Design an enzyme around this catalytic site. Structure first.
Site, short mmCIF file in Angstrom:
data_model
loop_
_atom_site.label_atom_id
_atom_site.label_comp_id
_atom_site.label_asym_id
_atom_site.label_seq_id
_atom_site.Cartn_x
_atom_site.Cartn_y
_atom_site.Cartn_z
N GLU A 1 0.78 -1.24 0.00
CA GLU A 1 0.00 0.00 0.00
C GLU A 1 0.83 1.31 0.00
O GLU A 1 0.68 2.15 0.91
CB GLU A 1 -1.02 0.00 1.14
CG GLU A 1 -2.12 -0.96 0.91
CD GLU A 1 -3.01 -1.10 2.12
OE1 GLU A 1 -2.67 -1.93 3.05
OE2 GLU A 1 -4.05 -0.39 2.14
N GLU B 1 -3.71 -9.11 -1.49
CA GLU B 1 -4.35 -8.99 -0.18
C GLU B 1 -5.83 -9.07 -0.44
O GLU B 1 -6.53 -8.07 -0.61
CB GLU B 1 -3.93 -7.74 0.59
CG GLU B 1 -4.33 -7.76 2.06
CD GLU B 1 -3.78 -6.56 2.86
OE1 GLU B 1 -2.50 -6.29 2.94
OE2 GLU B 1 -4.67 -5.87 3.38
N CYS C 1 -8.83 -9.59 0.83
CA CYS C 1 -9.49 -9.40 2.06
C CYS C 1 -10.34 -8.15 1.90
O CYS C 1 -9.86 -7.13 1.35
CB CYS C 1 -8.45 -9.19 3.14
SG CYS C 1 -9.19 -8.73 4.72
N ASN D 1 -12.64 -11.65 -10.05
CA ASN D 1 -11.20 -11.60 -10.40
C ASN D 1 -10.75 -12.49 -11.54
O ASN D 1 -10.04 -12.01 -12.45
CB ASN D 1 -10.33 -11.91 -9.20
CG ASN D 1 -10.24 -10.75 -8.23
OD1 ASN D 1 -9.66 -10.88 -7.22
ND2 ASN D 1 -10.87 -9.63 -8.54
#
Ligand SMILES: *[C@@H]1O[C@H](CO)[C@@H](O)[C@H](O)[C@H]1NC(C)=O
EC number: 3.2.1.45
Length: 497
Positions: A235, A340, A342, A370
């Site tokens: 990030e 990630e 989540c 995805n």
């Protein structure tokens, strides 16, 4: 082999109860003759990856929706599936008695579990740590003579990873990501908040930072562990937001470019670890296509980038087609990976909800989207959390597929763990996504893939309350008459010859 032991905590579905002497598991994988299929079924009502078989017949008795396998329509090959061995996950697992640990590790990593073949590994502390630290905390150590691993790696993380890999069938790929650098390399001299590297790409700070990656790879390799890949920063956009509470390090898309081109790319290429891949971004898809345009239109940067890593958390803010599909249009030879995987998950709910079918559904729906937008791989966040969704030294917002109760020597396998498993267990690395055509508009999420040996796998998600009659056609075999019950997920598997 052993069934799910259900327990309700007052949410829409059950968890599966495991402990030192009992966990639900699978018999070694066994698949039927041409003309026969296997179906694994999980339902909101309580079924957990329950197996049945039936016929693939020559005549069609279905009058409802038809999904037709189109094996000649071929897409991306799959890298795989896993999650993250954060300090928090390691501490939770290690608070179990050793036989309970093994049942947990088998649950994720074994063929008798769900077949994970990727582990994401943080390079030092993140918010799922109990303390802040980097591997080089002594200031002004630009040659990084005092780089070393703490207890967190050498005692918790590395042992659990060795044990995952003993357990695993498939080779496991390791993926590493940094949260922050040593704070003396940073413009703000802090582990978090608004702050970048000091200086400019090419300088002493950026060289030192690039060298840290190599130091980390050497250190892990002393422990006989090698990396499939590293991300350029977790990030990086978070480090541009003033007061950002977690470990971070800001890069604009341009700074990321230049750091790659000038420093990380050349340094890795110049090490014995030059086969390790690099993934740019590792951030929200809202940042796409721009970030990829900035980095990848510069050939001195692009020659070092193998892929683009994405996070799911803020997906609701940015359509898959505008971000993932558009990025693939523009850089069709650069893989997309969900580093990630989540989300989580509504300001008025708790971190951890035991037995939430909805959060399960969100995982599989998201893997399906995805997969239909070119994604080759998924890494869930924390492998295990405690029931408060911790430890987190800042604050818990997220659930995990396994919830560990350290007071009872017990762990809970959430519906999320089985939604994940409906994919990870049946989609080995090298699997190729193929066409799957709906005959008419419908509510189901569905995807098809072909295994490396040519056998077919189809997952079908029903997020509605109502049963949907379904036929699946394979032109090479026939018709599979079935039903997608309300609130279920099915994985179908079959030989094609
Ligand atoms: C572990 O779970 C199994 C299956 O429910 C159970 O029979 C056994 O009592 C459990 N062990 C403890 C200490 O509860």
């Amino acid at each position: 082999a052993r069934p799910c032991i259900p327990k309700s905590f007052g949410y829409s579905s059950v968890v599966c109860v495991c402990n030192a002497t009992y966990c639900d598991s699978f018999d070694p994988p066994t698949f039927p003759a041409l003309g026969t299929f296997s179906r694994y079924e999980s339902t909101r009502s309580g079924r957990r990856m329950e197996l049945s078989m039936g016929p693939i017949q020559a005549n069609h008795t279905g009058t409802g929706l038809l999904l037709t396998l189109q094996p000649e329509q071929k897409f991306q090959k799959v890298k795989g599936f896993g999650g993250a061995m954060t300090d928090a996950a390691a501490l939770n697992i290690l608070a179990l008695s050793p036989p309970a640990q093994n049942l947990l590790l088998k649950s994720y990593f074994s063929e008798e579990g769900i077949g994970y073949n990727i582990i994401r590994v943080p390079m030092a502390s993140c918010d799922f740590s109990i303390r802040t630290y980097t591997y080089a905390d002594t200031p002004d150590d630009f040659q990084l003579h005092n780089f070393s691993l703490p207890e967190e790696d050498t005692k918790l993380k590395i042992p659990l990873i060795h044990r995952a890999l003993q357990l695993a069938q498939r080779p496991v790929s390791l993926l590493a990501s940094p949260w922050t650098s040593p704070t003396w390399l940073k413009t703000n001299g802090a582990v978090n908040g608004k702050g970048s590297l000091k200086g400019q790409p090419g300088d002493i700070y950026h060289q030192t930072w690039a060298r840290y990656f190599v130091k980390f790879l050497d250190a892990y390799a002393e422990h006989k562990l090698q990396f499939w890949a590293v991300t350029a920063e977790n990030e990086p956009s978070a480090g541009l937001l003033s007061g950002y509470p977690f470990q971070c390090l800001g890069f604009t898309p341009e700074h990321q470019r230049d750091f790659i081109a000038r420093d990380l790319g050349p340094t890795l290429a110049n090490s014995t670890h030059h086969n390790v891949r690099l993934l740019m971004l590792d951030d929200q898809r809202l940042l796409l296509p721009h970030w990829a345009k900035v980095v990848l239109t510069d050939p001195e940067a692009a020659k070092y980038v193998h892929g683009i890593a994405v996070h799911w958390y803020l997906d609701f803010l940015a359509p898959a087609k505008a971000t993932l599909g558009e990025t693939h249009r523009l850089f069709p030879n650069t893989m997309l990976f969900a580093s990630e995987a989540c989300v989580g998950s509504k300001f008025w709910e708790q971190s951890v909800r035991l037995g939430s079918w909805d959060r399960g559904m969100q995982y599989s729906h998201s893997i399906i989207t995805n997969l239909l937008y070119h994604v080759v791989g998924w890494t869930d966040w924390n492998l295990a959390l405690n029931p408060e969704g911790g430890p987190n030294w800042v604050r818990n917002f997220v659930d995990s597929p396994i919830i560990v109760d350290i007071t009872k020597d017990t762990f809970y396998k959430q519906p999320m763990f089985y939604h994940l498993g409906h994919f990870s267990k049946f989609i080995p690395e090298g699997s190729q996504r193929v066409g799957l055509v709906a005959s008419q508009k419908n509510d189901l999420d569905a995807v098809a893939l072909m295994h490396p040996d040519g056998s077919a796998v189809v997952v079908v998600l029903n997020r509605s309350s109502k049963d949907v009659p379904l036929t699946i056609k394979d032109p090479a075999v026939g018709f599979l008459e079935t039903i997608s019950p309300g609130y279920s997920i099915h994985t179908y598997l079959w030989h094609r010859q």
